[PDB]
């Protein structure tokens, strides 16, 4: 059988913020398996891409401008429902309405440095997974505590 | 004053994942004094029995053979309204409807392997503990930040 | 722009059980800058000026003499929204109804005893920074990830 | 086959303050198996075998009534050379002389309150493991990260 | 017993990096009791004062702009030897020969920025005390773990 | 004036004993800069070439063997002296003779299994760095806490 995969991005305040380490250890501790990842700047031309969607939005070329000021760390996660499950562990899109043992709940408090992307659907997950990575980048392999984890 | 009582027991994917004392100390944390703890391996009847509510379910067998295959914390804690708080802190009984901060949130993703038991009642936490635990097994004496936790 | 803030009290049983520097710490790594922070037996006119809301209740004697009892950690903190959040993070004021994450959903039981005091608006916040810090004792200073916590 | 194994007591001011949880994720994370694990008060002639070869010490009369003031959590823990890696883990016999890092430099200051026991030998492990558990109270199982553990 | 006291200064680079709880609830876990605590800029006039006997040293003018230059968390702590220990946990003056486990060890690298001070001796412990602390400033209680810390 | 940079890479066992996050974090707590980072599983002529100076030693075909075993997580720190520091903060190559604090220290017990490498000297980082990074793989980005992390 092959699992459900998200893409997982931590944005350039988390990386600022010394946050990554936090922030993995929170997928690992909850059984779901890092199959990608990778750290670089990225363009503006392919964060257009990602954020395709908001091109029209007011928002839109400073959010572009702010995802290029730093880099990012780019992961996938797989495991049973790993995409909605991973956006509760994010919390809300902003802050403010994020609870307390989310991840933007505990360490942010503005919608424009809200440390972390998570794919909002298996759909945009695909489509992501294949902007951000080569399919030779995702690596398979099981985890020892798989049987654990999964009936 | 004699306080209330509920039996919590971590689950072998619990025993195995490396969580024990990660469990252990959210109970210590919040205040809950600790009345009794072995670590042993359930026979299958002693299981049927913990959860002989359930015999009739579709489940029960696959659940009784994952709660044998490996050994078992089991614990008595004690303080007001444990049972239900306990509850609280454990999540929903499937992961995938717990919030980050509880135990089952934090740590797990099915049903069938969600690391941990609490009693959902005082009537089963009496039924379970008699069920796990000789009267002599029990230990009492008094937390040093007891008038720290309690008017 | 200068943010809004509040003031946040550790309770006596906060420092009695340990807490200081774990509920420090949630709200460095939330993004609040600390602005004042002084420790403290206050006393009991100070303290009923400070619940003078509850004067009339039954319970305010009581929570006079155990405010009263021993040493308070008396902080301003500042952020956006940070009077509200500051709320949330803190739980009910029943740690029973407060939600595992929460400073009082993690650490308390009793309300009674439940380790933390928070402003629960920005008028109540002004008046209780006035009543417990000197003019001098706020000091003035930016946080270098400020940048990366704000647009 | 069978690796060395060591007896490991949490002394009644490690629970009372709160860190069995903490103890018990030290050896954990550093990949040992918990053996066998009971939560009691031991009694004043037991410890007094426990600690038979200190007899004749002046502070021996009050390490047994100290030792007896308060439940203890007795634990066989097993792993490759587990009794001097469990020795240097705990840190020296006075807290004073123990580095940051080992449990007694980290959580405790006088010889008289050090939180923990450890066996000091393979003989002397072997000998307390016989006195304090029941040969059916050593649980058998293999880890699931035993191969990651171990080449 | 009238407890040795010891001066801990969070310097301003462990402010501005957000380590305030964490370095607090290391002194906490310890079993030591804070006895004293306030958050401040402190003049030049007053650095020079307490760096005195460093007056001639190279470094002396860099290093009385730099802790000059943010807020300081300035505490006194009460326990055991804690002067002695105290130091222990810190490390050595050069984060580069200081310990993992220590708190320079864990948390800095050069020396100009090694993030806290403690007092090297008695001596000095109580005239650093006296420079920072008026008395009335110094809390006295008795904390509830007290007979589980010493003997 | 670029600062020191070195190889550190998590072994297999480290990603599947779910350190990932824990290991990431002690080098940014540290205040060392991520400079690169991926996840791959590397192919033993690879592995050969990493080590090729220990391959007539007997334990040779077995560690490119396990090494090669799962993926691997590469990165490069930056940082004042992180060369030396790095391989004080991983501990001994043989994890029995590491102390608590250390990465090796705290997480391990088997030479074998001994779940991270650190380049044990500048000359060893560069021909490191080279083998497993493209120059373009190295992101150049100033940390916002710079300032309170050097002088
Ligand atoms: N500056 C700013 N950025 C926003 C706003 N709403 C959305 N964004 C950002 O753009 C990202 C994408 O928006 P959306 O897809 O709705 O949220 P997400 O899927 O929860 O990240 C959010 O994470 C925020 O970084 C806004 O009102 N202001
Ligand atoms: N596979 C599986 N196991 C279940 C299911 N529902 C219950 N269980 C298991 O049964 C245990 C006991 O069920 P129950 O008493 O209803 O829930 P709990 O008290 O919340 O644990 C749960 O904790 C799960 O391990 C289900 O539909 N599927
Ligand atoms: N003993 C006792 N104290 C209470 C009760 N309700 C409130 N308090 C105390 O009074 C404090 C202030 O009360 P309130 O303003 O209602 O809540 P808060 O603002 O959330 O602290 C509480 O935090 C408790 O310490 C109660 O029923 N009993
Ligand atoms: N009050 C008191 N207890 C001591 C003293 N020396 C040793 N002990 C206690 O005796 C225990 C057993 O002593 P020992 O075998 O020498 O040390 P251990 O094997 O490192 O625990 C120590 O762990 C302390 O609890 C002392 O001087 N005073
Ligand atoms: N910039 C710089 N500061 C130094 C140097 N040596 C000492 N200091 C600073 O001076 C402070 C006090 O020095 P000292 O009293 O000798 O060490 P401490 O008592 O361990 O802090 C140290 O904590 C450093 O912050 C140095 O060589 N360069
Ligand atoms: N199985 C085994 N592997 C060893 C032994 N010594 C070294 N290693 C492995 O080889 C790696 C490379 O060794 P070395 O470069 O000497 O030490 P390092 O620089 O501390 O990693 C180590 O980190 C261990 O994984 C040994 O005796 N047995
Ligand atoms: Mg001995
Ligand atoms: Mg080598």
Same mark, same amino acid.
């Given at each position: ?5 998200? =893409? ?42 990602? &954020? ?7 928002? =839109? ?45 505990? =360490? ?24 951000? =990575? ?6 398979? &392999? ?10």
């Amino acid at each position: 059988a092959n699992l459900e995969r998200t =893409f997982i991005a931590i944005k350039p305040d988390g990386v600022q913020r010394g946050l990554v380490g936090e922030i993995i250890k929170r997928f690992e501790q909850k059984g779901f398996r890092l199959v990608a990842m990778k750290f670089l700047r990225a363009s503006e031309e392919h964060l257009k891409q990602h &954020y395709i969607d908001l091109k029209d939005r007011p928002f =839109f070329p400073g959010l572009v401008k702010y995802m290029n000021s730093g880099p990012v760390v780019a992961m996938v996660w797989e495991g049973l429902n790993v995409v909605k499950t991973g956006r509760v562990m994010l919390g809300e899109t902003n802050p403010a309405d994020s609870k307390p043992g989310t991840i933007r709940g505990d =360490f942010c408090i503005q919608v424009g440095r809200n440390i972390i992307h998570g794919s909002d659907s298996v759909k945009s997950a695909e489509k992501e997974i294949s902007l951000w =990575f080569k399919p030779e980048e995702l690596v398979d &392999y099981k985890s020892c505590a798989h049987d654990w984890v999964y009936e």
